[PDB]
């Protein structure tokens, strides 16, 4: 039972309060002393990695326990969580990793590259998300997976992008820094 | 003529639920400004803390202001008195009182409630938990957040990050409001 590092992977395009409240609640419920946010590397035109990274940095800046890693952005090619977990175990050799996933992402886990290997590298925490069933029953045939209720914020990055594309407000769905960053760099307009 | 939103509340504390509701209303009704009105004085926090949290929370939004009209008036806060005060202080403006679903059903038992609809139009915003049942109804993003849960999280040293604005997180900790 070594020290606990949270890991939250995502496109973060943009990062929103949904992601951040999930990470925060998990950090508290599992006494994580840090959460590492990992934007993924590069139909829909995903915003450039540097913008996704910077928005995530700005969004997490104010929280004492939140940091951001360039591991996936700097690796190049397809982002796979096995590679993300490999990298972070190398960077934090004496820590136990806790990969944080929302209900919709958890439900997809069997399609992930070398998915069996995931549970040799980290423990997984599924968090609730409005409009999705939180469940471990899809991998019942496989304390490597814990399910957690977090505050229900019905926010998606898709909705945030659509609003911003329509000049409709994204205030309070995303941190004030992200509102500014999105307007200044004209990310979805 | 100005189209003013009015969001009355205890705001103990103000949270993103309140703010996202006012933001969406401001957008859909093309309001020039939304005025947040903390009520005057179940141990509710002092008026000045509730006023200043609301000022800090609204500061960054270009279209949000805060009135101390109910604080300065003293005694029991009645929305008929709030709206008449704002009819005086902004005589050439249309008023829109924004209320959630939990408070919408209770309106029939507000002091002189029938007079409310001679001073302003009302906007009911959806809220998680409750059903949304002179008056318009608008869907807003569903943030299942309550002031009560926030106070409870604060008192148990659990995080209120991302449920309330960063400024309110700092203010609540600095002034030890629910500890
Ligand atoms: N409101 C909300 N409340 C609670 N949780 C919420 C949420 N909105 C999103 N989330 C969650 O936040 C996280 C970030 O979402 P989002 O920005 O869309 O990111 P997303 O594209 O869903 O990717 C989630 C993670 O899965 C990894 N993945 C995906 C596909 C394949 C493989 C592989 O190895 O083959 C790995 C990916 O690298 C990333 O780290 C997700 O886990 C999502 O469920
Ligand atoms: N997550 C959420 N999403 C969307 N809306 C949400 C919400 N949480 C609260 N709300 C709403 O935001 C508003 C502020 O909530 P909160 O701080 O709890 O405020 P609250 O104490 O419920 O009072 C709201 C207003 O009603 C007035 N009132 C109440 C009772 C009697 C009378 C009278 O004249 O006799 C007047 C009071 O003066 C204040 O202006 C409410 O309308 C609430 O429903």
Method used to determine the 3D structure? X-ray
Give A3's contacts (C-beta < 8 A, 6+ positions apart). Answer: A33, A94, A95, A96
Is the sign of the CA dihedral A122, A65, A146, A42 positive or negative?
A: negative
List the one residue out of A109, A85, A104 whose CA is nearest residue A36: A85
Dist. CA A109–CA B27, nearest whole Å: 38
Cis ω for the linkage preceding A14 (within 30 of 0): yes
- Which chain A residues in 111-140 lie under 8 Å from chain B, judged by CB atoms? 130
Report yes or no: A21 and A36 within 8 Å, Cβ to Cβ.
Answer: no
Task: Quote the minimal CA–CA distance from A27 to chain B in Å.
Answer: 9
Cα B51 → chain centroid: 11
Cis ω for the linkage preceding B13 (within 30 of 0): yes
Which residue in A171, A180, A181 has the most chain B C-beta atoms within 10 A of its own C-beta, making it the best mutation to test that interface? A171
**DSSP-derived 3-state class of residue A58:** helix
Q: How far is residue B154 from each of residues A88, B64, B158, B164, B168, measured CA to CA in Å? A: 33, 26, 6, 11, 11
Give B57's contacts (C-beta < 8 A, 6+ positions apart). Answer: B14, B19, B164, B165, B167, B168
What is the number of CB-based contacts under 8 A between chain A and chain B?
57
Q: How many domains does one find in chain A?
A: 1
User: What lines the ligand 2 site, CB under 6 Å?
Assistant: B 8-11, 17-18, 21, 37, 39, 77-79, 99-100, 102-103, 110-111, 125, 127, 143, 145-147
Ligand 1 site-directed mutation target among A20, A102, A104, A149, most atoms within 8 Å of CB: A102
Q: Which of A24, A63, A172 sits opposite B16 (nearest CB)?
A: A172
Domain of B40 in residue numbering reads as: 1-179
Q: What is the CATH number of the domain that holds A111?
A: 3.40.50.620
Quote the tokens at residue A144: 């490597």
What was the resolution (in A) of this experimentally determined structure? 2.2
Report yes or no: B142 and B128 within 8 Å, Cβ to Cβ.
Answer: yes
List the one residue out of B77, B64, B81 whose CA is nearest residue B120: B81
Report yes or no: B11 and B147 within 8 Å, Cβ to Cβ.
Answer: yes
């Amino acid at each position: 039972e070594r020290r606990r590092l949270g890991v939250m992977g995502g496109t973060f395009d943009p990062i929103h309060n949904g992601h951040l409240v999930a990470a925060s609640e998990v950090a508290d419920r599992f006494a994580l002393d840090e959460v590492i946010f990992v934007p993924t590397g590069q139909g829909r035109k995903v915003s450039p990695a540097e913008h996704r990274y910077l928005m995530t940095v700005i969004a997490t800046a104010s929280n004492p326990r939140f940091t951001v890693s360039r591991a996936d952005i700097d690796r190049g090619g397809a982002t796979y969580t096995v590679d993300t977990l490999t990298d972070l175990r190398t960077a934090h050799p004496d820590a136990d990793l806790y990969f944080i996933t929302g209900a919709d992402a958890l439900a997809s886990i069997l399609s992930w590259e070398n998915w069996e290997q995931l549970f040799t590298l980290a423990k997984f925490i599924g968090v609730s998300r409005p409009g999705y069933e939180l469940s471990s029953d899809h991998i019942a045939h496989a304390d490597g997976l814990s399910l957690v209720e977090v505050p229900a914020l019905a926010i998606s990055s898709t909705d945030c992008r659509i609003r911003a594309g329509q000049a409709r407000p994204i205030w309070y769905l995303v941190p004030d820094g992200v509102v500014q960053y999105v307007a200044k760099h004209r990310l979805y307009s």
